[PDB]
Amino acid sequence: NAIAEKGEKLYHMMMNKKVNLIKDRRRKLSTVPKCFLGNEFVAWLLEIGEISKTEEGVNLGQALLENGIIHHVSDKHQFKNEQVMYRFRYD
Amino acid sequence: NAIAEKGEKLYHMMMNKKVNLIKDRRRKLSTVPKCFLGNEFVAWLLEIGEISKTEEGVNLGQALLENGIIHHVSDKHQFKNEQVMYRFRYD
Amino acid sequence: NAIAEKGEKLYHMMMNKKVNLIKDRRRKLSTVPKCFLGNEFVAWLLEIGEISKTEEGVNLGQALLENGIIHHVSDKHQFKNEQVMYRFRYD
Amino acid sequence: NAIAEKGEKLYHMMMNKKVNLIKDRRRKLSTVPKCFLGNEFVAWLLEIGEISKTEEGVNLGQALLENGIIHHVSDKHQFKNEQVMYRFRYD
Amino acid sequence: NAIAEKGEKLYHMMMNKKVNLIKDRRRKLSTVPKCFLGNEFVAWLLEIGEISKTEEGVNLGQALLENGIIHHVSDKHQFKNEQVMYRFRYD
Amino acid sequence: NAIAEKGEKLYHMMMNKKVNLIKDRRRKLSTVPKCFLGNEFVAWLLEIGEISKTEEGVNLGQALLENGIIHHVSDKHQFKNEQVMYRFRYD
């Protein structure tokens, strides 16, 4: 297949000691400050019964979420030069 | 086509006044506190020349990102009962 | 730590009345037209028993999905100048 | 390393003719109806000059997006039994 | 509404035989090699009881994941000219 | 505001020494094997001129992508008990 042969070629060309486009790449995610898991939270509300049922816990967490009283913690590892939003701790 | 006919049927069944699985659905994202755009930031560093070039700005922002000195602002609108992480403002 | 000190500095520089890279930012998601939740749907098929079991409901919904008879509703809030796809209602 | 040895073992156990947890898996995405690319769109507005500059085109597309006049086309291939939203064509 | 009228206009302009920004668009995802589903895996460990409970299976899979002994299979269909990472099979 | 007061309360309850739902959380991403960046790749093809223009490089990479000759490297840090796909190195 035409498209296979191009790939196997390109492979070897990047693998060239000369060219070195292909390396191992470490990846770091900042350790996160004082934070919680949704499931643990909704679980906990039941153990304490300020929720009758689960969908009460989600609805509640959803409520909190959409008013910024909580904020989801993003799993993006990769700083982007785009119209993308970021924050310092210092607030 | 078999699979089309099932769909058109199912459609009408959810569209049943009785069943009402199909509605308009508002969506809310919390307004975000004091925050910045990657592009504006990397742009600004150049206007002020504490960056020689762009890839300096990204590399820098990346550095900040992966040590939690900045945190990306997530665009998820939807509170999840899963092993997913969340935070209050109060820190 | 070197990388901390740069951050705390940069912070104050963007916080400069002069510079104003750091603001509150409202976020809007279009209200969605007549649409449904996967869970509610698979749930409903059981209440009516045109599904023996759950994995029947998923498999079915999956079937529908991959033939465009249904389309997932995207949670992206942010119009992108990229090779990214978009649609008007008018179809 | 402890954790490596568990992996290599588990591997062979799923690879067991008996167990067969590990197969090739085809993946289908519905062909999309009449739709457009952001970049092509913003590009086109310039060719026709109803945009002075690019950030006008994005701002405009963003405007359209957040009022549902356009909707981003999702790349999810995988029907989910969750509080996740979906639509038929028939609208 | 001002913003509606712009949309309906723009629509018709792209719909122009002349302009043709708006087409059907096929989408392809590579068939995946020998691979497994999380749920099936954690399920299987129980059937065989090398897991006492579920959260043991997740914790284990998580362990494997974060040491590269397994790698999640990405659902991105769209090759990006960005600081984004890719691999050949030939390893 | 009603919904604020619930949040500030819930906060303190999870912050209870007793309850401890709220901790720092380390995050690990496996170091990736021999791999490449899209931008570097498309860049390189130009330096060597087996591409006339950029959109040739993307189109090519896209071609490779959708036939599994290359595979995008996922940034998910979080093993999921779902119908989600995974792979060992051992292939």
Contact B90 F11 (CB under 8 A): yes
Q: What is the resolution of this structure in A?
A: 3.1
Scanning the structure block, which residue is given the tokens 């190195």? F89
Scanning the structure block, which residue is given the tokens 């990736």? F32
CA D16 to chain centre: 34
Nearest to A65 by CA among A44, A38, A43, A88: A38
CB of F7 within 8 A of CB of B79?
no
CB of B44 within 8 A of CB of C21?
yes
3-state secondary structure of D3: helix
- Report the gap between the CA of E6 and the closest CA in chain F (Å): 30
Residues 23-42 of chain E whose Cβ lies under 8 A from any Cβ of chain D: 23-37, 40-41
Phi, psi of D27 (to 5 degrees): -140, 130
Taking the C-alpha atoms of residue C61 and residue C46, their distance in angstroms, rounded to an integer, is 13
CB of E84 within 8 A of CB of F72?
yes
Residues 44-83 of chain F whose Cβ lies under 8 A from any Cβ of chain A: 44, 60, 63-64, 67, 69-70, 75-78
Taking the C-alpha atoms of residue D3 and residue C81, their distance in angstroms, rounded to an integer, is 44
Taking the C-alpha atoms of residue C13 and residue B81, their distance in angstroms, rounded to an integer, is 39
Mutate one of C1, C5, C11 to test the A interface: name it (highest A CB count within 10 A): C11
- Report the gap between the CA of E17 and the closest CA in chain A (Å): 33
CB of B71 within 8 A of CB of A86?
yes
Residue B38: is it exposed, middle or buried by C-beta count within 10 angstroms (0-12/13-18/19+)?
buried
User: Which among A34, A41, A78 has CB closest to B91?
Assistant: A34
DSSP E30: P
Cβ contacts of F71-74, under 8 Å, gap ≥ 24: F71/E30, F71/E73, F71/E74, F71/E86, F71/E87, F71/E89, F72/E74, F72/E76, F72/E79, F72/E84, F72/E85, F72/E86, F73/E71, F73/E74, F73/E84, F73/E85, F73/E86, F73/E87, F73/F32, F73/F35, F74/E71, F74/E72, F74/E73, F74/E74
Taking the C-alpha atoms of residue D29 and residue A54, their distance in angstroms, rounded to an integer, is 33
First to last CA, chain F: 57
The residue of chain C nearest to residue D79, with distances taken between CA atoms, is C62
Mutate one of C1, C3, C8, C10 to test the B interface: name it (highest B CB count within 10 A): C10
Question: What is the experimental method?
Answer: X-ray
The residue of chain D nearest to residue B14, with distances taken between CA atoms, is D88
Contact C88 E25 (CB under 8 A): no
CB of C67 within 8 A of CB of B3?
yes
Count CB atoms within 10 A of the CB of residue E18.
7
User: Which among C8, C11, C78 has CB closest to A83?
Assistant: C78
* Whole-number Cα distances in Å, B34 to A64, A90, B44, B66, B87: 19, 10, 17, 20, 16
Contact C58 D64 (CB under 8 A): no
Cross-strand partners of F25: A32
**Amino acid letter, residue B85:** M
Contact F86 E35 (CB under 8 A): yes
Contacts of D8 in chain F (CB under 8 A): 90
* Whole-number Cα distances in Å, F58 to B59, C75, F41, F52: 24, 26, 10, 12
Contacts of A88 in chain C (CB under 8 A): 7, 11
Detail the DSSP E strand segments found in D2-91: 23-25, 32-37, 70-72, 85-88
Q: Is the Cβ of E8 closer than 8 Å to some Cβ of chain C?
A: yes
Cross-strand partners of D37: C85
Phi, psi of A87 (to 5 degrees): -145, 145
Contact E3 D33 (CB under 8 A): no
Scanning the structure block, which residue is given the tokens 């896209």? F62
Count CB atoms within 10 A of the CB of residue D52.
10
Scanning the structure block, which residue is given the tokens 């691999």? E87
CB of C34 within 8 A of CB of B23?
yes
* Whole-number Cα distances in Å, D49 to B61, D53, D58: 35, 9, 14
Count CB atoms within 10 A of the CB of residue C15.
15
User: Which among E4, E10, E67 has CB closest to D3?
Assistant: E67
Please state whether beta strands E23-25 and C70-72 pair in parallel, antiparallel, or not at all (unpaired): unpaired
First to last CA, chain A: 57
Mutate one of A66, A75, A90 to test the B interface: name it (highest B CB count within 10 A): A66
Write out the two tokens for C16.
């400069």
Cross-strand partners of A25: F32
Contact B27 C30 (CB under 8 A): yes
CB of C31 within 8 A of CB of D85?
no
Taking the C-alpha atoms of residue E34 and residue E16, their distance in angstroms, rounded to an integer, is 46
Q: Where are the alpha helices (DSSP H) in chain E?
A: 2-15, 38-47, 54-66
Taking the C-alpha atoms of residue C65 and residue D29, their distance in angstroms, rounded to an integer, is 8
Show which subunits contact B, needing at least 3 CB pairs below 8 angstroms. Answer: A, C, D, F
First to last CA, chain B: 57
Count CA atoms closer than 13 A to C63's CA, side-chain side: 13
